[PDB]
Amino acid sequence: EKEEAIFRSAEMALVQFYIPQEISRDSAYTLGQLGLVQFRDLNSKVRAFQRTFVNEIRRLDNVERQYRYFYSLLKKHDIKLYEGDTDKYLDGSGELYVPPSGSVIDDYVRNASYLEERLIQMEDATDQIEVQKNDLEQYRFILQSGDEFFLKVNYVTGVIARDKVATLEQILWRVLRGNLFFKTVEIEQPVYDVKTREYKHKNAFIVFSHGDLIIKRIRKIAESLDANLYDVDSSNEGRSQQLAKVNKNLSDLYTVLKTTSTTLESELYAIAKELDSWFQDVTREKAIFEILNKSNYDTNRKILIAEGWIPRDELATLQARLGEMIARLGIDVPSIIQVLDTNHTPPTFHRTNKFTAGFQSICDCYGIAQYREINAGLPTIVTFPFMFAIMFGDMGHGFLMTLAALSLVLNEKKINKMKRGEIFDMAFTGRYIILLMGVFSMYTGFLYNDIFSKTMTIFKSGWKWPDHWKKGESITATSVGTYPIGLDWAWHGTENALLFSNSYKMKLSILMGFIHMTYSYFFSLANHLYFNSMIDIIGNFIPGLLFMQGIFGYLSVCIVYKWAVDWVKDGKPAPGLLNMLINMFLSPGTIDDELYPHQAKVQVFLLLMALVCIPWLLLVKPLHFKFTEDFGDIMIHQVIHTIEFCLNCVSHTASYLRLWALSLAHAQLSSVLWTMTIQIAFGFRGFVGVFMTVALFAMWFALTCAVLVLMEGTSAMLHSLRLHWVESMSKFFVGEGLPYEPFAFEYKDM
Amino acid sequence: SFSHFLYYLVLIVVIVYGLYKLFTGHGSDINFGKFLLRTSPYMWANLGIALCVGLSVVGAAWGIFITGSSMIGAGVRAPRITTKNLISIIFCEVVAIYGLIIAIVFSSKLTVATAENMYSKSNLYTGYSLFWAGITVGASNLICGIAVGITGATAAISDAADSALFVKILVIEIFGSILGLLGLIVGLLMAGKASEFQ
Amino acid sequence: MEGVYFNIDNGFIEGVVRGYRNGLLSNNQYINLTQCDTLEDLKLQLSSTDYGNFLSSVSSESLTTSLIQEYASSKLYHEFNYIRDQSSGSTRKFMDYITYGYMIDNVALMITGTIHDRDKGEILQRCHPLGWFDTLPTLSVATDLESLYETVLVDTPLAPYFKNCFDTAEELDDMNIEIIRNKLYKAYLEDFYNFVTEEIPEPAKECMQTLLGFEADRRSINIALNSLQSSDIDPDLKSDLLPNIGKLYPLATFHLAQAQDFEGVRAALANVYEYRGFLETGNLEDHFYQLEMELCRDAFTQQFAISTVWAWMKSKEQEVRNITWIAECIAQNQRERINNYISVY
Amino acid sequence: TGKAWCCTVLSAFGVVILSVIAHLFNTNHESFVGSINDPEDGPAVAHTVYLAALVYLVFFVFCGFQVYL
C-alpha cells in the first residue's frame, strides 16, 4: 500500500534499466508518461558535444528554431495562435499513449525546412513593397504642401526624423555662416521603418541656396543624417503634374501589396491552426533524447544502461507499466529493470494534498531537507499562523481576513482554472494558510479581549469599583475574582492599562518563544536516534539542552512561579526578575529579594552547569573523532558551532520580543484610527450627524482594510515567517538536500 | 570650503571669549561644574534613552541597506543566495533589539522626584548614569551595525561565486556581531547601581 | 572607510557586475573549447557556459568566425549599456569617460575610411558601437580638419582635446590622421586621469590610476616602435604624442622621444623595472595583454570600488579575442597555434 | 461590473456595524457612554446612527441588482 510521507521524506530506491537499443526510443516515452523516475547522469565526464545522441538533438533543435521563427511572424502580422487541449495526452496519470513514428518526426523536419524557405522568401518580397509604399507616400506628402512652403536648383528639400531636425539646422547654420533660410513642417502621424521594425515621427524640410558646391554639401550633410531627399519642380504646374504622376504610381502599387499580403496571410493561417500541436510533439521528442544522453551505452551488446531514483512503494506500478509496453511490442526483453543498492544520496520527496502543499512550499523555499530528515512542514502547519495570531490579535480584523480567505476556499474550483497574475496567484496558493491565519487571529483576539479596538463584556468582571464617587474623582478598583477567559474588560480606558498589558504580553512572548524553541530543538534528538548518531546525543544534544534550559528555561520557570505566589498577602517584596536574571551572572551568590528559599544556592549551581557545558560541547566530539586534516576540519567546525549556539540562545530568545512589539503597535494604531474617524461622528446631531456618520464610517472601514488588515497584517505575517526560518529551523534543520524532480511531460507554453 | 570655515570661526570665537573672561579676572564665570549641578537630571536621562534607541536603529538601518543592496545585486545571476544570506540581515536587525531592550530597562527608572529632593546626590547620579549608558549602548550598536553590514555585503557577493565560501566568511560576521553584545553588557553595568528618581 | 557610503548608489551596480565576473571563462573551459571539431561543435560547447543560447537563432550553415565575433561582442555591449543606464552621478561620468576612447578611434576610422573613396555604408558596419554619437556619420562630408571641427566636432564631448591638432597641414592622408588620432588620445588620457584623481574615492582612485598608467605606457611604447618605420621625425614632435601620466614619464618618455633605432628604444626601457623584459624576448603584443589581465585580476580583489567596471570591461574584451582566435583555428583546420589564448582565470 | 462589488460589500458592513453601535448606545452600554467624554444622550446619537444604517441599506439593496444582472 502507498505510504504517507509528510513526517519524513518518502523512501527511495535506485533502479538500473537494461534497455536494448531497439526499444530505447519507445521505453523512454513510457517512462516520461509515468513521470516518476529521476535519472542520474552517467556521462558526467564526457564533453558536451561527444554525447552519443548529439546529432539527433541537433535535428530537433533546428526544427525548434524554425518554429520560433514562425511564431515571430504570427506576431508580426497579429494572428492568434490556436490553443491545443492540455489534457489530450495525460495529466500526471501515468496513462500509456502511443508515440509518434520515426516517419512522422521526419515529416516535421522536412515540412519545417520547406516552410522556412517559402516564408523567408515571401516575407522579404513583401517588405520590399512596403519600403516603396512608405517612400512614395513621403514623396506624395511634400508635393501636397502649399507653395508658401517654397516662398523664401534654388533649394534642397526632403523628409527627416522628428528627433534629428534640431541637429540639422544647428549644423547648417554654421556651414552657411548664418545665411540660413530654413523651413520645417510636421507630418501628422508616425512613419513606419520596417528595417528597424519601429515607427517614428517625421518632418518635411527645405533649404534655400544658389551655389552649386553649397547645394552639393547640403545634400551630403542631410544624407549623413537619416533624411530622404526629393526633387520638386519650382512651378505650381510642375508640382501638380508631378503629384499626378506620383498618385498614379502609388495608386497602382496598392494592387501588388494587397495580392502579396493576402497570399502571405493565407500561408500563415494554415500554420497558425496547427503550430502549437507541432511544437508539443517536437519538444517531447527532443526531451527524451536529452534523457537518453544521460544513459551509458554498451556498444558490444547494444544496450543502454540508465540509473534512476524511484519511490520505494511505487516500484510495483513501474514494474507493471513496463510490462504493458513489453506486451504491446511483443518482445522477450530480459528483465528490463533491476533494483540496485549504492552509497549515493537519494532525492528528498514529500507527498502533499491541497491543504498541506501551501505550508510545505514555505519550508522548501528556505532549503530542501536532508534525506529522511524530520520535515519542517508538519510543525509549520499550526505554529506559523498561530505565531502570526499572537501578534495580529483582533477579532474584527481576524474575522475580516477569515471571510477573504474563506471566499477563495469556497470558490477554488472556479479560481483554479482561470489564469492569474502572481500578485493574486500567491494569495490563491496560500488560501488555506490565510484561512487558519484568520481563524487563530479570532481566537487570540478573544483572549486579548479586543474587537475593532473595543473590549467585550462577556463575563462578570473580577474587579469591583468603589461604592460612590463624584464627577471627575479618581477611583481604584478592588479585586474580587479572576476573569475566566482572556483579559478582564475592566482594564478598558484605564489610565494605567499599558502598565499591565505590557507586563502581560512581554512575559507571554518570552514563554511562547522559549516553548517553541525547546520544542523544535527536540527534533534534533529525533534525527539523531533515527540515524543512530549516538555521538551527537552525547556531543551536541545534551550539552546544548542543559545550557539553554539552565538559563532561559530557568527564567521561564521563574516567570510562571511569580504569578503563583500571592505577594501582597504574604507581605513579602515582589522581586524584579530582570534584575534577578542579570545578578546571577554578574554577582553570583548574592540576592536582593528572594523569590523562593535557597535561591542563591541553586542559582550558583545553574551558573556552574552552564559554564561546564561550554567545553563539554566544544571538545568531546572532536576528541572522540581523533580517538576513533580531518580532525582540524572537525575541530574548527565544532568550535564555530558552539559560538553560534551559545550566542544564538541570547539573540533568539531576545528576538521573540517582536511578538509583543507588533501586537502593541497594531493595537495602538487601531485605537487612534477609531478615535480620529468614527469616534468623531458621534458628536454631531441631526442631518449633518447622519451624513458625517455615513462618510466617516467609509473612511474608517477603508483605512481598516488597507492599512491594518492588509499592510500591517502582511508585515506581521512575514515576521512570523522569519521566526520560523531562523529562530526555529536553525536548531533542528540541516538542509542541503537534493530535490526530487522526476522526468515527466507537460504542456510547453511557447 | 564653507563648512570648514565655519568650524574654524567657532573655534576662534570660543578661544577669544575664553581669554576675555580669563584676562579680566572673571575666569570663574564659565564654571562647567555649576552647569552640571543646575541642569535638571530628567534632561540627561531622556536624552540617554532617546539616543539609545535612536542611534541603535540608525546602526541597524545603515547595515541593512549595505547588505540588502548587495544581496539584490548579486542575486540577479544567482537567486539561491537570497534566502541563505538572510542571516546577514538578522545580525544587523538584532542590534536594534538590544537598543530596544535597554530602553525598556531604563524606562523603569523615570519616576517623579519630590521637589525638596530634586537635585540631591542620588538623583544627579542617576541622571548622569542613564545618559552615558544610553550613549554607550547607542553608539556601540551604531558602530556594530555598520561593521556587520559591510561584512555581510562581502559574504553575499562571495556566496554568489562559490557556496563553499559562505560558511568560511560567516565567521568574520559573528565576530563582528559580538561588539553590540559587549556594548549591552557595559550598558547594564553602568546603569546597575542607579536608583529610581526618588 | 570605503564601504560606509559606496552602497548608497553603487550597491546594485557592484553586485551585478561581479555576477558577470563569475561568468568569465576559466582555463578549463578554454581547454574544452580548443578540442571542438567544427564550429557547430563550438556553439554546442559554448552553450554550456555563461554565453548560453546567444547563438540559438543562427542556422547551421550561417556559422562563421566573423558572425561569432559579432554576436559575442554584441552581448558585451548590451550588458555595458545596461550597467551604465542603471547608474548616476560620478559613476555615470566615469562610465561615459570609458566610451570616449572608442569614439576617438571611430573618428579616425571614419576619416581615413573616406579619404579613400568608399561610402559610409561600409564604414558604419566597421565602427565600434560603444563609440557612437549622432553626428558621427556626418564626418564623411569633408576632407579637412578645419571643416570637420567647425561643422561637427565642436558639439562632441571630444571638443576640448583638439587643442594641438590644428597646427598640422591643410591636407589629410593616412599619416596625418594617425598624428591626429594619437594627439587626441594624449589629451583624453590626461583628462581622464585628472577626473579620476579628483572625483573618484579610494581605493578606486589608486587602482584606477594604476590601470590608466599602464594604458598610457602601452601607447608610448607602441608609438615609439611604429615611428621607426618612418625615415625621420622631429623628436620635439614625437614628444607631443607621448602621454604624461604613465610610469615611463618623464625619464623614459624623454629617451623614447629621442630614440632613432630599436636599440635606442630597448635602452630607453631597460632602466624601468616593470617592463625590462618586454622587448628582449617573445611577442610584444601578447606581453601587454598578459600584463593587462594581471592588473585586471588584481583590481577584482578590491571591493566597494568602481574600478571593477573597468576590470570587467577590459577582461571580457580579451575573452572575445580568445573565442575568435580559437574559432579561427577551428574554421581553418590549423591548430598548432590554438593554445595561444591568454587567460588569467 | 466591478464597481458594484466594492459598494455592496462596504455597505453590507455599513449596515451591521452601525446597527450594532446604535444598539449599544440605545442601551447606554458603559463602553460607549461610560466616560465623561462620551456624548451625553445615548438614544439621541443612537437615532442619528440608525439613520446612517438605513442609508447604507439603500446602497446595499440597490447594488444587489447591479451585481445580480
Side-chain angles (χ1 to χ4, degrees), chain A residues 214-232:
Chain A
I214 308 303
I215 290 158
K216 294 280 163 53
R217 175 162 287 191
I218 292 167
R219 280 177 168 272
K220 290 211 297 184
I221 293 169
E223 294 174 0
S224 73
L225 312 174
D226 59 23
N228 295 94
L229 284 293
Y230 295 106
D231 190 11
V232 182

Side-chain angles (χ1 to χ4, degrees), chain A residues 194-214:
Chain A
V194 298
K195 63 182 183 295
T196 311
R197 193 37 272 183
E198 285 191 319
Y199 38 95
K200 288 168 283 186
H201 298 291
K202 292 208 179 188
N203 286 64
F205 73 95
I206 180 164
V207 195
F208 303 98
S209 278
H210 292 76
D212 176 21
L213 299 176
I214 308 303

Side-chain angles (χ1 to χ4, degrees), chain D:
Chain D
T1 180
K3 57 193 175 78
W5 282 109
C6 175
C7 187
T8 192
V9 172
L10 184 149
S11 55
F13 293 106
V15 169
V16 175
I17 294 173
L18 283 287
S19 64
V20 170
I21 288 169
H23 182 261
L24 280 315
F25 271 122
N26 205 42
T27 53
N28 296 322
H29 193 271
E30 183 274 352
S31 184
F32 286 88
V33 306
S35 78
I36 56 180
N37 299 324
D38 291 314
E40 311 292 10
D41 194 359
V45 292
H47 179 272
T48 305
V49 172
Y50 272 128
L51 264 291
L54 263 292
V55 165
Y56 272 118
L57 183 57
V58 172
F59 281 105
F60 176 66
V61 300
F62 169 72
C63 296
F65 284 132
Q66 298 293 330
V67 297
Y68 175 88
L69 69 89

Side-chain angles (χ1 to χ4, degrees), chain A residues 45-50 54-55 57-58 61-62 65-66 68 116 163-164 167 170-172 174-175 177 216-218 220-225, chain C residues 31-32 35-38 40-45 48 56-60 120 134-135 137-143 147 150-152 154-155:
Chain A
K45 304 294 184 68
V46 180
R47 302 179 187 78
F49 65 89
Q50 295 185 298
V54 61
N55 283 338
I57 285 169
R58 278 171 168 153
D61 190 9
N62 194 18
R65 179 192 62 85
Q66 285 163 344
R68 272 192 288 272
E116 179 177 25
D163 188 5
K164 293 189 179 68
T167 298
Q170 177 69 335
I171 291 172
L172 290 177
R174 299 191 185 114
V175 169
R177 297 296 192 265
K216 294 280 163 53
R217 175 162 287 191
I218 292 167
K220 290 211 297 184
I221 293 169
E223 294 174 0
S224 73
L225 312 174
Chain C
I31 289 168
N32 278 264
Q35 289 164 358
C36 297
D37 292 327
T38 67
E40 193 169 41
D41 307 311
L42 190 66
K43 182 176 76 162
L44 180 53
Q45 188 61 31
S48 183
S56 54
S57 57
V58 177
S59 299
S60 178
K120 71 182 192 295
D134 288 342
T135 53
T138 306
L139 294 180
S140 61
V141 69
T143 64
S147 299
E150 75 177 18
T151 59
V152 174
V154 162
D155 294 327

